[PDB]
Amino acid sequence: PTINQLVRKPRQSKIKKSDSPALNKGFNSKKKKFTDLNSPQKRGVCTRVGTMTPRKPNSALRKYARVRLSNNIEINAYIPGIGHNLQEHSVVLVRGGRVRDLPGVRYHIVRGALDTSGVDGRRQGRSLYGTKKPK
Amino acid sequence: TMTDPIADMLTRVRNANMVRHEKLELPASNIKKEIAEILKSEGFIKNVEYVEDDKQGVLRLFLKYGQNDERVITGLKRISKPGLRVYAKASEMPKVLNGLGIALVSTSEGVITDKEARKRNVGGEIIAYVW
RNA sequence: UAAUACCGGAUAAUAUUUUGAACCGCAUGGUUCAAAAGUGAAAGACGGUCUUGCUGUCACUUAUAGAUGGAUCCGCGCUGCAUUAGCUAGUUGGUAAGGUAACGGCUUACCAAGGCAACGAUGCAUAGCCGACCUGAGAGGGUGAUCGGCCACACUGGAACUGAGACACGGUCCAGACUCCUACGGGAGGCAGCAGUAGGGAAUCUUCCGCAAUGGGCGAAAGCCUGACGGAGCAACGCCGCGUGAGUGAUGAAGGUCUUCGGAUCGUAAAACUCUGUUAUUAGGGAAGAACAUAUGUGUAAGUAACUGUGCACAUCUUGACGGUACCUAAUCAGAAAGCCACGGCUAACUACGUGCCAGCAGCCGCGGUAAUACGUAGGUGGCAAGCGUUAUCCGGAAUUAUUGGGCGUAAAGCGCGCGUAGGCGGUUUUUUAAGUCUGAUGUGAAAGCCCACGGCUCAACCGUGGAGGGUCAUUGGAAACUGGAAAACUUGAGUGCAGAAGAGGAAAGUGGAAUUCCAUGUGUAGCGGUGAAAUGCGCAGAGAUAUGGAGGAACACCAGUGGCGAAGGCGACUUUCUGGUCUGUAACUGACGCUGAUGUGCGAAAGCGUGGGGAUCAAACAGGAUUAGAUACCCUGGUAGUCCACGCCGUAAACGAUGAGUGCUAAGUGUUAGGGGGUUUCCCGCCCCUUAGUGCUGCAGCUAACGCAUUAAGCACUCCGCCUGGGGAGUA
RNA sequence: GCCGUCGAAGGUGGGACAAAUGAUUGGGGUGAAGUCGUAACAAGGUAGCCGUAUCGGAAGGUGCGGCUGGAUCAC
C-alpha cells in the first residue's frame, strides 16, 4: 500500500481463534462471569454416554459421551482408548483433541486417573494413560 | 508526474544497462550534474557532460561498460524517494557491499559519496544505492 | 484531676491591609527599602553548672530558608471497537461573591452563546500503568508473575471530625442492605491485611517463627508492634549443579534376543578384578560469616563563671529464627540414588513374535486384513534423565503482513465508473532559514534487569561491581545539500496561447424507414395449430393465407472494426440542441500553478418497483393444455406483472482485463486511429522515415507456478485508492 | 432546638432498551388415519455464465440484461 494509507491503517494480521473452546473455570463459580481460563484440565462429569458407529471398511466402533466440566458447558465428546469402568453421570477429565472419527466435536477424554480408568497391561502407559509404570 | 529525479535517473540507467549502450543524455539538475561527475570519478560512466537548455540542461552520460559491454557495477536503486525523506547521520551511514558498493549522500553542505560520508563524518539524506 | 490540655491578653516583623520608596520582569506582575493597626508564646519539659542565672536537649511560637514531599497545569507517547458520529449547557468565556496551595464554573448570581465533532469527540467493551518481561537474528510480535515506582479500591452508598496530611486497607456517622444475635425491645459485624477456614477451583505454600537483619511509627532510649521483612516450612513448581558408578576385564559367558542356526544378540556387558566415596551413610567440625548493631562508660575542637552541661569520632561492651546452616573432615560399598519417550517415516533408533481391516494405533502421510519395526509382546536400538511425556498459550516457523518481508495476467483482491475537500508527495535555477535535515556540546534518561567485563558463591545457578547500552526529551555549536519554508525568477509539465485536425460523447428535440404485434379492406380456402399423436388454443361466419390499408409502440437491415466517445455504465436509423470531451502541431509564456485522491460525493446493464400513461412486441407467472391422479412441470394457445413512456426507488451485474491513475525509461519487427514534417514525387496521396497520442499481432530483456506481456509491459522505478488473510461456512447472519 | 442549601438511600408514577417468556395467530410439513380419490399409462425428458425478477414447494424453468471463464480422470 501507499505510505500514507499504510500510516492511516494498522496492517492488521489474520489472528486466529482457538478452535478449542477451552474456557476453563475462570469466574464460573462466582458471578457466573465468563472468563477465558486456559487451564489444561477442569474437573467435571459426563452426564450421558453413547456410541456412534463408523462406516465401512474400518468398523472401529467409537463411543461418545456428553460432558460438563467445572464451567458445565454442554458438549458431546468421543471416548478413545480400550477398557473402562465408568457409566452415566461419572466424573471424567477431557483433553483437547480432534480426531478423524466424527465432526461436531474437538475434544477427547483421558484414561487412567478418573472414572474412565485406563489399562496397565501395555507399556505405552508407562508415563501416560493415567496409569502408573507397569510394575 | 515526474515525482523524483533519482528514480527516473536510475531506472533509465538500468534500462541502458540492459540495452548495453553508453551514450545517453537526460535533463539534469545541478545535483544530477554533480552526481554524474561523481560517477565519472567512480568510472563506470566513462564520460559525463552537461549543457543548459529548457528547463534544466541535458546531462549527457557516456558509460564505461565492461570489456565486453558488461555492467562494471552490479546493482542500482534510489533511496530517498517521494514521501520517504530518509536521512542518515554519521554512524547511520550504510555500506552497501562495503567499499565496492557505494552511495552518495546529500549532507549539510552538499552531496558526498559513501567514502566521503564515513570519511568527513557528516551525515545526511542518503540518496540512492548503487552496487 | 494534671498537662507542653483550653481560653485570655503583653509584645511582632518580610504577617494582613493600606503609606511611600527604588529595581525589574510576560500583560498579569516580581524583587528590595523606608510607614498604620494585629495578635506571636510551652510562667514547657528536663539536665547541668548552680545564682538557678546560664545554657544544656528537645520542644514551643514567629519570619526568613534550604530541603522534602505533595499538589496543580502543560507538551508527546500513552486500548479495541465508528455494526461507536454527533457530543454539548456550569457547559463556553467573562463578570462579582465565595472557595481551596493555587487555578478556574471550581461553585454560585450576571450577561453572552458557546464549547467540542471524522486527524474518530461521543458511546460501548475492556483495562490497573509503565519500568519491565517472553519468543523472535533482529525487525518485530506478545506479555505485564513477584520487584521499582505511579494510580484506583478497601460490605455498599452518602458524607463529614480529626490532623501537615485521611473523607481514613485494620477512624467515625448515617442509610442501604447483608448477615448475626439479643431480655426481641434493639443491639453486632465486613480477610480484594496475613495465615487459615468454608466453598471454589487443576491446585498453589505454615491458621511456622522471629524481629537475629534492616524497616519504620514514638521517644533520648530501652522498648512497643512489624502477616514489612528475615528466616526456615511445603509444590522434582523453575533453572543450575553431584551421582544414580567408573577402569579393567571378549568370551562374544551363560542367558533375553533373533537367527539362515553357524553365529550374532545384549556386550567390555557378564563373571571376575581394580578403584570412588562423588552421591548418598554415619562421628564430628561449622552450625561460618552474617553481628555492624543499642547506648554506656575515653580524653581531646563550637561555648559555657563552669566542652558545666553538652554535642564529634574514638576507648570499651552488647546482637542468630536460618542453624549447632551452608560447607568441610574420619569412614561406607559400587554399593542407596533414574527413569522415561520413541523406533514406518517425517526425526534418533528394528527386528522376532502373538495379533488379525478386527482389535485397534492414530500429530501427518495413514497403517493394521492374519505377515504390523504403524496392535500388542520380547529382544535390540536410539533419544533423553532428575526427570520424561501430554495438554493450555506467545512468538520463531509464521516473511502466515507482505516497512524490513504479497499480491490483484489468472489461485484472494481494482469502485462500475466519477468529481473533487483535506491530505500525500512535490518541476528548473538564485539566495537566506536552520525549521527540519545533518552535526557535535549541555542537562537529562530511577535502580535493577538490560549487554560487556569483573567479584563472590566449588562451579553452575546466583547476586554483586563497574562499564556499556539506554530519549522519538529539552537546549546550544556549526551546516544549507535536501525537504520544508522566506524571497527571486525561468519554463514544456500545468496553465493557456494560435493554427488546425477529431468524432455511436452527452442529453433534449424532431425526421424517416423495414417491420414484432394488432388490425382496416379485398380475395381466398379448411383447417391453422403444437406433437409422439396432438391436446389445447385459433378457426370454416374466411383461422392459418393472401394482397391493398393502417395503427401503436418498438428498437433501428448494412456500416460495425483493435472505428470511435467515454471514466465507466454503456454509448451506433437520420438530423438538430448546446454543450462536454479528442488530438496534431503550438511554446504563445504568468510561473509549479502539479499529483492521486479518506470523508464526502455525481454518474450510471437489466430486472424489480412507486406513482401517472403506454403496451408494439416480448414475457414470467398463468390457464386452456400435451403429459399424466396432478400437469401450470414443456411440448403447446393465448395471454400475461412488467418490459415500454415521467420521476424516484432504484446504484446492482460477467459494470471483467478481478490489469486504480499519472509519471518517465527501456531491443526489435510490426500495424492501426487520427497528426505533422522532411526529403522523395504530379497531391509521396502515392514513399520512406521521425516522433504526436492512443489501440494491435510476433517478439530483446525482464518477470510470472504456468499462461504471457513485452513501449500500449504483466520490465523498470515513483506520489496517491481499494481489496485481499484456506476452503467454505455465509455476501449470508 | 427548629427551619432552610444539598443529601444518599429508598420508593412511587410516565415511559425507553428491554431480557427469557410468550397471548393466540400465522407458516410449514404430514398421512397414521375421519373426507374418498380413482385405478389409466404413467411421465412424448431435459440440459455452455453472473446480477436481477416470476413462478416452479423445491428439484428448475420463463426469463430481462449483457456473457469471459478455468470437458473426464485414473492407479
DSSP state at residue B45: S
Give the C-alpha distances (Å, rounded to integers) separating A118 from A71, A92, B42: 25, 12, 79
Q: Å from B83 to nearest chain A CA?
A: 7
B17 touches strand C (CB under 7 A): no
C-alpha–C-alpha distance, residues B128 and B80, integer Å: 6
Place of cell 552496487: B131
- Residue A87's identity, in one-letter code, is Q
CA atoms within 13 A on the CB side of B72: 16
C-alpha–C-alpha distance, residues B51 and B46, integer Å: 17
B47 touches strand C (CB under 7 A): no
C-alpha–C-alpha distance, residues A43 and A25, integer Å: 9
C-alpha–C-alpha distance, residues B21 and B61, integer Å: 11
Q: SS in 3 state form for chain A?
A: CCHHHHHCCCCCCCCCCCCCCCCECCECCCCCECCCECCCCCCCEEEEEECCCCCCCCCCCCEEEEEECCCCCCEEEEECCCCCCCCCCEECCEEECCCCCCCCCCEEECCCCCCCCCCCCCCHHHCCCCCCCCC
Distance A65 CA to C637 C1' (A): 65
Strand order in the sheet with B105-107: B87-88, B124-126, B105-107, B111-112
B67 touches strand C (CB under 7 A): no
Using a CB-CB cut-off of 8 Å, the residues of chain A touching B83 are 2-4
C-alpha–C-alpha distance, residues B98 and B53, integer Å: 38
Cβ count near A40 (within 10 Å): 9
Technique behind the model: cryo-EM
Q: Which pairing describes strands B47-50 and A107-109: parallel, antiparallel, or unpaired?
A: unpaired
Cβ contact A46:A65 at 8 Å:
yes
Place of cell 557516456: B62
Q: Can you give the C-alpha Rg of chain A in angstroms? A: 20
- Residue A18's identity, in one-letter code, is S
C-alpha–C-alpha distance, residues B61 and B57, integer Å: 13
Please provide residue B48's backbone torsions phi and psi, each rounded to the nearest 5 degrees.
-130, 155
Within its chain, how far is the Cα of B91 from the centroid?
21
Nearest CA in chain B to A3: B83
Nearest CA in chain B to A2: B83
Grid cell of A111 as nine digits: 484414561
Nucleotides of C under 7 A from a protein CB: 81, 199-203, 339-342, 357-364, 366-368, 376-378, 387-393, 395, 400-403, 406-407, 423-430, 436-440, 478-483, 490-493, 592, 594-595, 660, 662-667, 700-702, 715-726
- Asked if A58 reaches chain B (Cβ–Cβ under 8 Å), the answer is no
Beta bridge partners of B128: B78
Distance A129 CA to C47 C1' (A): 84
* CB < 7 A to strand C: residues 85-104, chain A: 95-97, 99-101
C-alpha–C-alpha distance, residues A106 and A103, integer Å: 8
C-alpha–C-alpha distance, residues A14 and B126, integer Å: 35
B23 touches strand C (CB under 7 A): no
* CB < 7 A to strand C: residues 45-64, chain A: 56-62
Provide the terminal-to-terminal Cα distance of chain A, rounded to the nearest Å: 65
Cβ contact B117:B95 at 8 Å:
no
Cβ count near A93 (within 10 Å): 21
C-alpha–C-alpha distance, residues B109 and B122, integer Å: 9
C-alpha–C-alpha distance, residues B8 and B96, integer Å: 21
Task: Give kind and range of the element (H or E) at residue B26.
Answer: strand B23-27
DSSP state at residue B72: S
Contacts of A21 (CB under 8 A, 6+ apart): A73, A106
C-alpha–C-alpha distance, residues A49 and B121, integer Å: 78
Place of cell 473402562: A84
Within its chain, how far is the Cα of B95 from the centroid?
15
| DSSP notation for B74-101 | --EEE-SBTTB--EE-TTT---TTTTTS
Q: Does residue B55 have a cis peptide bond before it, meaning omega lies within 30 degrees of 0?
A: yes
Torsion of the alpha carbons at B120, B40, B78 and B5, rounded to the nearest 10: 110
Q: Å from B21 to nearest chain A CA?
A: 34
CA atoms within 13 A on the CB side of B106: 14
Distance B71 CA to C663 C1' (A): 27
Cβ contact B124:B106 at 8 Å:
yes
DSSP state at residue B58: E
